[PDB]
Protein backbone atom coordinates (compact mmCIF):
# COMPACT_ATOMS: atom_id res chain seq x y z
CA UNK A 1 0.00 0.00 0.00
CA UNK A 2 0.98 3.64 -0.43
CA UNK A 3 1.97 5.21 2.90
CA UNK A 4 1.13 8.92 3.33
CA UNK A 5 3.19 10.82 5.90
CA UNK A 6 2.48 14.20 7.41
CA UNK A 7 5.65 14.61 9.41
CA UNK A 8 4.23 17.52 11.41
CA UNK A 9 1.30 16.31 13.54
CA UNK A 10 0.56 19.67 15.15
CA UNK A 11 1.32 23.33 14.77
CA UNK A 12 0.43 26.71 16.17
CA UNK A 13 0.19 29.89 14.09
CA UNK A 14 -1.09 33.40 14.37
CA UNK A 15 -3.82 35.15 12.46
CA UNK A 16 -2.44 36.32 9.11
CA UNK A 17 0.43 33.83 9.03
CA UNK A 18 1.39 31.55 6.17
CA UNK A 19 0.78 27.92 7.21
CA UNK A 20 2.47 25.15 5.21
CA UNK A 21 1.50 21.55 5.80
CA UNK A 22 3.48 18.84 4.04
CA UNK A 23 2.61 15.38 2.84
CA UNK A 24 4.95 12.70 1.48
CA UNK A 25 3.81 9.56 -0.36
CA UNK A 26 5.84 6.32 -0.29
CA UNK A 27 5.83 6.29 -4.09
CA UNK A 28 4.81 8.41 -7.07
CA UNK A 29 1.07 9.17 -6.99
CA UNK A 30 0.85 11.15 -10.23
CA UNK A 31 -0.55 14.30 -8.63
CA UNK A 32 -3.68 12.47 -7.40
CA UNK A 33 -3.37 14.10 -4.02
CA UNK A 34 -6.21 15.72 -2.15
CA UNK A 35 -6.58 17.75 1.02
CA UNK A 36 -9.36 17.73 3.66
CA UNK A 37 -10.20 19.90 6.64
CA UNK A 38 -11.77 18.38 9.74
CA UNK A 39 -13.20 20.91 12.11
CA UNK A 40 -13.01 20.31 15.90
CA UNK A 41 -16.66 19.21 15.87
CA UNK A 42 -15.73 16.41 13.43
CA UNK A 43 -17.16 17.98 10.23
CA UNK A 44 -14.99 17.03 7.19
CA UNK A 45 -14.82 18.90 3.88
CA UNK A 46 -12.57 18.67 0.82
CA UNK A 47 -10.34 21.73 0.17
CA UNK A 48 -8.09 20.86 -2.75
CA UNK A 49 -8.06 17.97 -5.24
CA UNK A 50 -5.68 16.78 -7.98
CA UNK A 51 -2.80 18.55 -6.15
CA UNK A 52 -3.82 22.13 -6.79
CA UNK A 53 -7.47 22.43 -7.85
CA UNK A 54 -9.54 24.47 -5.46
CA UNK A 55 -12.96 23.01 -4.62
CA UNK A 56 -15.78 25.36 -5.50
CA UNK A 57 -16.90 27.21 -2.36
CA UNK A 58 -13.55 26.82 -0.58
CA UNK A 59 -11.78 30.18 0.05
CA UNK A 60 -8.86 31.03 -2.23
CA UNK A 61 -6.42 31.27 0.71
CA UNK A 62 -6.18 27.47 0.47
CA UNK A 63 -3.76 26.30 -2.21
CA UNK A 64 -1.89 23.11 -3.01
CA UNK A 65 1.35 22.34 -4.75
CA UNK A 66 3.63 19.40 -5.41
CA UNK A 67 4.48 16.52 -7.69
CA UNK A 68 5.77 12.99 -7.50
CA UNK A 69 5.94 12.05 -3.85
CA UNK A 70 6.04 15.49 -2.31
CA UNK A 71 3.08 17.79 -1.69
CA UNK A 72 2.07 20.84 0.30
CA UNK A 73 -1.05 22.60 1.46
CA UNK A 74 -0.63 26.32 2.04
CA UNK A 75 -3.03 28.51 3.95
CA UNK A 76 -2.19 32.10 3.10
CA UNK A 77 -3.31 34.81 5.47
CA UNK A 78 -4.65 32.43 8.17
CA UNK A 79 -8.12 33.19 9.50
CA UNK A 80 -9.91 32.49 12.81
CA UNK A 81 -12.19 29.84 11.26
CA UNK A 82 -9.20 27.73 10.12
CA UNK A 83 -8.75 25.90 13.44
CA UNK A 84 -8.95 22.29 12.27
CA UNK A 85 -7.01 19.13 11.52
CA UNK A 86 -5.79 18.83 7.92
CA UNK A 87 -5.36 15.53 6.06
CA UNK A 88 -3.85 14.60 2.77
CA UNK A 89 -5.04 11.63 0.73
CA UNK A 90 -3.79 9.84 -2.37
CA UNK A 91 -6.36 8.77 -4.94
CA UNK A 92 -3.98 7.04 -7.36
CA UNK A 93 -4.28 3.41 -6.24
CA UNK A 94 -6.45 1.31 -3.93
CA UNK A 95 -6.62 1.32 -1.06
CA UNK A 96 -6.94 5.07 -1.03
CA UNK A 97 -4.83 6.14 1.89
CA UNK A 98 -4.71 9.21 4.13
CA UNK A 99 -1.95 11.01 5.98
CA UNK A 100 -2.00 11.06 9.74
CA UNK A 101 -3.35 14.60 10.07
CA UNK A 102 -1.87 17.94 11.07
CA UNK A 103 -3.69 19.75 13.89
CA UNK A 104 -3.68 23.56 13.66
CA UNK A 105 -3.99 25.74 16.77
CA UNK A 106 -4.39 29.46 16.29
CA UNK A 107 -2.67 31.77 18.75
CA UNK A 108 -4.30 34.65 20.58
CA UNK A 109 -3.48 37.02 23.41
CA UNK A 110 -2.92 35.45 26.81
CA UNK A 111 -6.17 35.21 28.81
CA UNK A 112 -6.77 34.32 32.51
CA UNK A 113 -9.34 31.64 33.29
CA UNK A 114 -12.73 32.37 34.83
CA UNK A 115 -13.00 29.93 37.73
CA UNK A 116 -16.25 28.41 39.11
CA UNK A 117 -16.60 25.83 41.88
CA UNK A 118 -19.63 23.57 42.55
CA UNK A 119 -20.47 21.46 45.58
CA UNK A 120 -21.94 17.96 45.25
CA UNK A 121 -25.68 17.80 44.52
CA UNK A 122 -28.21 16.41 47.01
CA UNK A 123 -28.96 13.71 44.45
CA UNK A 124 -25.42 12.36 44.44
CA UNK A 125 -24.92 12.74 48.18
CA UNK A 126 -28.03 10.62 48.76
CA UNK A 127 -26.54 7.92 46.55
CA UNK A 128 -23.42 7.97 48.77
CA UNK A 129 -21.06 9.79 46.39
CA UNK A 130 -19.55 13.25 46.27
CA UNK A 131 -18.16 14.91 43.13
CA UNK A 132 -16.81 18.40 43.50
CA UNK A 133 -16.33 20.21 40.21
CA UNK A 134 -14.27 23.15 39.15
CA UNK A 135 -14.51 24.92 35.76
CA UNK A 136 -11.66 27.06 34.43
CA UNK A 137 -13.12 28.72 31.41
CA UNK A 138 -11.83 30.71 28.44
CA UNK A 139 -8.06 30.86 29.08
CA UNK A 140 -4.93 30.95 26.86
CA UNK A 141 -2.41 29.37 26.53
CA UNK A 142 -3.64 25.83 26.99
CA UNK A 143 -1.17 24.84 29.71
CA UNK A 144 -2.72 25.23 33.17
CA UNK A 145 -2.49 23.62 36.61
CA UNK A 146 -5.40 22.99 38.95
CA UNK A 147 -5.00 21.92 42.56
CA UNK A 148 -7.69 20.87 44.98
CA UNK A 149 -7.24 22.00 48.58
CA UNK A 150 -9.40 20.27 51.19
CA UNK A 151 -9.23 21.97 54.64
CA UNK A 152 -6.00 23.54 53.21
CA UNK A 153 -4.32 20.21 52.21
CA UNK A 154 -3.75 19.31 48.55
CA UNK A 155 -5.79 16.36 47.26
CA UNK A 156 -4.84 14.53 44.06
CA UNK A 157 -6.54 11.10 44.39
CA UNK A 158 -9.93 11.11 42.66
CA UNK A 159 -9.15 14.09 40.44
CA UNK A 160 -9.84 14.03 36.67
CA UNK A 161 -9.22 16.91 34.29
CA UNK A 162 -10.67 17.57 30.82
CA UNK A 163 -9.70 20.28 28.34
CA UNK A 164 -12.08 21.56 25.68
CA UNK A 165 -11.05 22.01 22.08
CA UNK A 166 -9.78 25.39 21.22
CA UNK A 167 -12.80 27.71 20.92
CA UNK A 168 -13.48 28.36 17.22
CA UNK A 169 -14.66 31.95 17.90
CA UNK A 170 -12.09 33.41 20.29
CA UNK A 171 -9.22 30.79 20.39
CA UNK A 172 -9.48 30.16 24.16
CA UNK A 173 -9.50 26.89 26.05
CA UNK A 174 -11.62 25.68 28.91
CA UNK A 175 -11.04 22.90 31.42
CA UNK A 176 -13.03 20.94 34.00
CA UNK A 177 -11.56 19.45 37.15
CA UNK A 178 -13.61 16.81 39.01
CA UNK A 179 -12.80 15.51 42.44
CA UNK A 180 -14.81 12.41 43.25
CA UNK A 181 -15.03 11.20 46.86
CA UNK A 182 -17.29 8.95 48.94
CA UNK A 183 -20.10 10.76 50.77
CA UNK A 184 -18.44 9.88 54.06
CA UNK A 185 -15.13 11.38 52.87
CA UNK A 186 -16.92 14.54 51.75
CA UNK A 187 -18.62 15.13 55.09
CA UNK A 188 -15.32 14.67 56.93
CA UNK A 189 -14.02 18.11 55.73
CA UNK A 190 -15.34 21.69 55.36
CA UNK A 191 -13.18 23.87 53.13
CA UNK A 192 -13.14 22.87 49.43
CA UNK A 193 -10.98 25.00 47.18
CA UNK A 194 -9.83 24.77 43.58
CA UNK A 195 -6.78 26.91 42.71
CA UNK A 196 -5.81 27.65 39.08
CA UNK A 197 -2.15 28.39 38.23
CA UNK A 198 -1.50 29.92 34.84
CA UNK A 199 1.14 32.10 33.18
CA UNK A 200 -1.31 35.06 33.26
CA UNK A 201 -0.96 35.64 36.99
CA UNK A 202 1.78 35.53 39.59
CA UNK A 203 -0.76 34.29 42.14
CA UNK A 204 -3.42 31.59 41.61
CA UNK A 205 -7.06 32.25 40.85
CA UNK A 206 -9.01 30.64 43.61
CA UNK A 207 -12.56 29.57 44.29
CA UNK A 208 -13.87 28.03 47.45
CA UNK A 209 -16.94 27.03 49.40
CA UNK A 210 -17.55 25.73 52.91
CA UNK A 211 -19.53 22.50 53.25
CA UNK A 212 -21.40 23.47 56.45
CA UNK A 213 -22.55 26.76 54.86
CA UNK A 214 -24.00 24.98 51.73
Amino acid sequence: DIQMTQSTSSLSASLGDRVTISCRASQDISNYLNWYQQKPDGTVKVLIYYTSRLRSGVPSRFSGSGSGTDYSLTISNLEQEDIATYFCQQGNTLPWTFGGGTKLEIKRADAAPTVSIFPPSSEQLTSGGASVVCFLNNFYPKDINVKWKIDGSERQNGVLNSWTDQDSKDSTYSMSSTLTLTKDEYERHNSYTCEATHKTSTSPIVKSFNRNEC
Binding site: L33, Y36, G91, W163, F209
Partner: protein, 226 residues
Protein backbone atom coordinates in the same frame (compact mmCIF):
# COMPACT_ATOMS: atom_id res chain seq x y z
CA UNK B 1 -27.50 21.09 -0.99
CA UNK B 2 -26.07 17.65 -0.33
CA UNK B 3 -27.22 15.83 2.79
CA UNK B 4 -25.77 12.45 3.94
CA UNK B 5 -27.24 11.28 7.25
CA UNK B 6 -25.72 8.19 8.87
CA UNK B 7 -27.54 6.01 11.35
CA UNK B 8 -27.27 2.57 12.97
CA UNK B 9 -24.15 3.18 15.09
CA UNK B 10 -23.97 1.68 18.56
CA UNK B 11 -22.39 -0.83 20.90
CA UNK B 12 -21.64 -4.33 19.65
CA UNK B 13 -19.62 -7.20 21.18
CA UNK B 14 -16.53 -8.62 19.53
CA UNK B 15 -17.48 -11.07 16.71
CA UNK B 16 -20.91 -9.45 16.45
CA UNK B 17 -22.70 -7.75 13.60
CA UNK B 18 -24.08 -4.28 12.89
CA UNK B 19 -25.63 -2.58 9.87
CA UNK B 20 -25.09 1.11 9.14
CA UNK B 21 -27.36 3.21 6.95
CA UNK B 22 -26.94 6.54 5.18
CA UNK B 23 -29.86 8.51 3.77
CA UNK B 24 -28.77 10.70 0.86
CA UNK B 25 -30.52 13.73 -0.55
CA UNK B 26 -29.95 16.88 -2.61
CA UNK B 27 -28.17 15.22 -5.51
CA UNK B 28 -28.78 12.50 -8.07
CA UNK B 29 -27.77 9.54 -5.86
CA UNK B 30 -27.89 6.98 -8.64
CA UNK B 31 -25.20 8.68 -10.79
CA UNK B 32 -22.45 8.69 -8.10
CA UNK B 33 -20.14 6.19 -6.51
CA UNK B 34 -20.41 6.09 -2.71
CA UNK B 35 -18.00 5.27 0.08
CA UNK B 36 -17.63 4.61 3.74
CA UNK B 37 -14.65 6.19 5.52
CA UNK B 38 -13.89 5.73 9.20
CA UNK B 39 -11.99 7.32 12.03
CA UNK B 40 -10.84 5.54 15.17
CA UNK B 41 -11.00 7.75 18.31
CA UNK B 42 -8.15 10.27 18.31
CA UNK B 43 -6.79 8.78 15.06
CA UNK B 44 -6.87 9.63 11.37
CA UNK B 45 -9.07 8.68 8.45
CA UNK B 46 -9.26 5.27 6.84
CA UNK B 47 -11.14 4.47 3.63
CA UNK B 48 -13.35 1.39 4.19
CA UNK B 49 -15.25 0.57 1.00
CA UNK B 50 -16.69 1.83 -2.30
CA UNK B 51 -19.66 0.96 -4.43
CA UNK B 52 -19.95 2.28 -7.96
CA UNK B 53 -23.12 3.41 -9.76
CA UNK B 54 -25.56 1.19 -11.59
CA UNK B 55 -23.96 2.29 -14.88
CA UNK B 56 -20.76 0.59 -13.65
CA UNK B 57 -22.69 -2.48 -12.41
CA UNK B 58 -22.33 -1.63 -8.74
CA UNK B 59 -18.66 -2.73 -8.61
CA UNK B 60 -17.45 -2.94 -5.01
CA UNK B 61 -14.03 -2.52 -3.44
CA UNK B 62 -12.87 -2.91 0.17
CA UNK B 63 -9.83 -2.12 2.31
CA UNK B 64 -7.93 -5.34 3.16
CA UNK B 65 -8.68 -4.74 6.91
CA UNK B 66 -12.41 -5.26 6.34
CA UNK B 67 -12.47 -7.43 3.25
CA UNK B 68 -14.82 -10.47 3.54
CA UNK B 69 -16.22 -9.14 6.87
CA UNK B 70 -18.01 -5.99 5.58
CA UNK B 71 -20.53 -5.67 2.76
CA UNK B 72 -21.28 -2.32 1.11
CA UNK B 73 -24.58 -2.00 -0.71
CA UNK B 74 -27.10 0.59 -1.95
CA UNK B 75 -30.78 0.99 -2.68
CA UNK B 76 -31.05 3.57 -5.43
CA UNK B 77 -34.88 3.79 -5.24
CA UNK B 78 -34.58 4.98 -1.58
CA UNK B 79 -31.32 6.89 -2.02
CA UNK B 80 -29.78 4.76 0.73
CA UNK B 81 -26.21 3.48 1.31
CA UNK B 82 -25.55 0.56 3.67
CA UNK B 83 -22.63 -1.09 5.43
CA UNK B 84 -23.15 -4.54 6.85
CA UNK B 85 -20.38 -5.20 9.35
CA UNK B 86 -19.75 -8.75 10.50
CA UNK B 87 -17.29 -10.44 12.78
CA UNK B 88 -16.50 -7.13 14.34
CA UNK B 89 -13.22 -6.44 16.11
CA UNK B 90 -12.11 -4.00 18.77
CA UNK B 91 -10.03 -2.09 16.21
CA UNK B 92 -13.23 -1.49 14.13
CA UNK B 93 -14.27 0.99 16.85
CA UNK B 94 -14.61 4.24 14.91
CA UNK B 95 -16.79 7.07 13.69
CA UNK B 96 -18.18 5.93 10.34
CA UNK B 97 -18.77 8.52 7.62
CA UNK B 98 -20.93 8.19 4.56
CA UNK B 99 -19.10 9.84 1.67
CA UNK B 100 -20.07 10.77 -1.88
CA UNK B 101 -17.37 10.16 -4.48
CA UNK B 102 -16.10 12.86 -6.78
CA UNK B 103 -18.09 13.28 -9.99
CA UNK B 104 -17.17 12.98 -13.64
CA UNK B 105 -13.46 12.15 -13.99
CA UNK B 106 -13.16 14.05 -17.30
CA UNK B 107 -13.84 17.24 -15.31
CA UNK B 108 -12.59 16.29 -11.81
CA UNK B 109 -9.61 14.03 -12.69
CA UNK B 110 -9.32 10.24 -12.63
CA UNK B 111 -7.90 10.17 -9.11
CA UNK B 112 -10.33 9.27 -6.37
CA UNK B 113 -11.47 11.89 -3.87
CA UNK B 114 -14.34 12.42 -1.49
CA UNK B 115 -16.64 15.27 -2.34
CA UNK B 116 -19.23 15.27 0.44
CA UNK B 117 -19.16 13.81 3.93
CA UNK B 118 -21.85 13.04 6.51
CA UNK B 119 -21.44 13.87 10.22
CA UNK B 120 -20.78 10.21 11.05
CA UNK B 121 -22.25 7.45 13.22
CA UNK B 122 -20.18 6.02 16.10
CA UNK B 123 -19.56 2.29 16.37
CA UNK B 124 -18.10 0.93 19.61
CA UNK B 125 -16.89 -2.69 19.70
CA UNK B 126 -16.42 -3.62 23.35
CA UNK B 127 -17.07 -6.42 25.81
CA UNK B 128 -18.39 -3.87 28.33
CA UNK B 129 -22.15 -3.49 28.87
CA UNK B 130 -24.35 -0.46 28.28
CA UNK B 131 -24.60 1.76 31.38
CA UNK B 132 -26.77 4.89 31.56
CA UNK B 133 -25.27 8.03 33.11
CA UNK B 134 -26.11 9.57 36.46
CA UNK B 135 -26.91 13.22 35.80
CA UNK B 136 -26.33 15.81 38.52
CA UNK B 137 -26.89 19.58 38.53
CA UNK B 138 -23.96 21.97 39.06
CA UNK B 139 -25.34 24.93 41.00
CA UNK B 140 -23.37 27.63 42.78
CA UNK B 141 -23.45 27.29 46.59
CA UNK B 142 -25.24 30.08 48.45
CA UNK B 143 -23.74 33.38 49.59
CA UNK B 144 -21.46 34.50 46.76
CA UNK B 145 -22.05 36.69 43.68
CA UNK B 146 -20.46 38.49 40.75
CA UNK B 147 -23.10 40.85 39.35
CA UNK B 148 -22.40 40.24 35.65
CA UNK B 149 -22.38 36.47 34.95
CA UNK B 150 -23.20 33.09 36.48
CA UNK B 151 -22.03 29.75 35.19
CA UNK B 152 -24.10 26.60 35.71
CA UNK B 153 -23.57 23.00 34.59
CA UNK B 154 -24.51 19.34 34.41
CA UNK B 155 -22.28 16.47 35.43
CA UNK B 156 -22.82 13.28 33.46
CA UNK B 157 -21.28 10.37 35.23
CA UNK B 158 -20.43 6.71 34.79
CA UNK B 159 -21.88 5.80 31.38
CA UNK B 160 -20.93 3.48 28.55
CA UNK B 161 -20.62 3.69 25.60
CA UNK B 162 -20.09 7.13 24.11
CA UNK B 163 -21.65 9.36 23.29
CA UNK B 164 -24.04 11.70 25.08
CA UNK B 165 -25.50 15.01 24.01
CA UNK B 166 -26.30 17.75 26.51
CA UNK B 167 -28.61 20.60 25.47
CA UNK B 168 -29.48 23.71 27.45
CA UNK B 169 -33.04 25.00 27.41
CA UNK B 170 -34.05 22.70 24.49
CA UNK B 171 -31.21 24.15 22.37
CA UNK B 172 -32.20 27.76 23.15
CA UNK B 173 -28.92 28.61 24.92
CA UNK B 174 -26.24 27.69 22.34
CA UNK B 175 -23.74 30.58 22.30
CA UNK B 176 -22.45 30.30 25.87
CA UNK B 177 -22.04 26.55 26.24
CA UNK B 178 -18.86 24.55 26.89
CA UNK B 179 -18.73 20.79 26.48
CA UNK B 180 -15.93 18.94 28.24
CA UNK B 181 -14.74 15.83 26.41
CA UNK B 182 -15.53 12.58 28.17
CA UNK B 183 -12.87 10.75 30.10
CA UNK B 184 -12.82 7.00 30.55
CA UNK B 185 -12.05 5.80 34.06
CA UNK B 186 -12.27 2.11 35.01
CA UNK B 187 -14.60 1.16 32.14
CA UNK B 188 -17.01 4.13 32.34
CA UNK B 189 -17.16 7.65 30.92
CA UNK B 190 -17.79 10.94 32.62
CA UNK B 191 -18.21 14.35 31.03
CA UNK B 192 -19.66 17.69 31.94
CA UNK B 193 -21.23 20.66 30.22
CA UNK B 194 -21.35 24.27 31.28
CA UNK B 195 -23.47 27.23 30.30
CA UNK B 196 -22.97 30.90 31.18
CA UNK B 197 -25.80 33.44 31.33
CA UNK B 198 -26.61 37.00 32.51
CA UNK B 199 -26.73 37.17 36.33
CA UNK B 200 -30.19 38.79 36.03
CA UNK B 201 -32.00 36.11 33.98
CA UNK B 202 -31.31 33.27 36.46
CA UNK B 203 -32.64 32.17 38.85
CA UNK B 204 -35.55 34.45 37.81
CA UNK B 205 -35.88 32.49 34.55
CA UNK B 206 -35.45 28.73 34.25
CA UNK B 207 -32.35 26.84 33.08
CA UNK B 208 -32.52 23.12 32.30
CA UNK B 209 -30.05 20.63 30.84
CA UNK B 210 -31.36 17.71 28.78
CA UNK B 211 -28.97 14.77 28.64
CA UNK B 212 -29.41 12.11 25.95
CA UNK B 213 -27.61 8.78 25.97
CA UNK B 214 -29.16 6.95 22.97
CA UNK B 215 -27.29 3.73 23.65
CA UNK B 216 -29.26 3.24 26.90
CA UNK B 217 -32.52 4.92 25.75
CA UNK B 218 -32.05 7.55 28.44
CA UNK B 219 -33.07 11.16 28.41
CA UNK B 220 -32.73 13.00 31.73
CA UNK B 221 -33.56 16.68 32.48
CA UNK B 222 -32.12 18.51 35.47
CA UNK B 223 -33.71 21.87 36.25
CA UNK B 224 -31.09 23.96 38.08
CA UNK B 225 -32.09 25.52 41.43
CA UNK B 226 -30.42 27.81 44.00
Amino acid sequence: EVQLVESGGGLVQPKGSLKLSCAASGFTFNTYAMNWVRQAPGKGLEWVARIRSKSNNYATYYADSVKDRFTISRDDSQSMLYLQMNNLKTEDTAMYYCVRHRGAPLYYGNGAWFAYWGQGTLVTVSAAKTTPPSVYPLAPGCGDTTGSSVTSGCLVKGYFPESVTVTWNSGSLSSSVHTFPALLQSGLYTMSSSVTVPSSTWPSETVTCSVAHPASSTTVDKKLEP
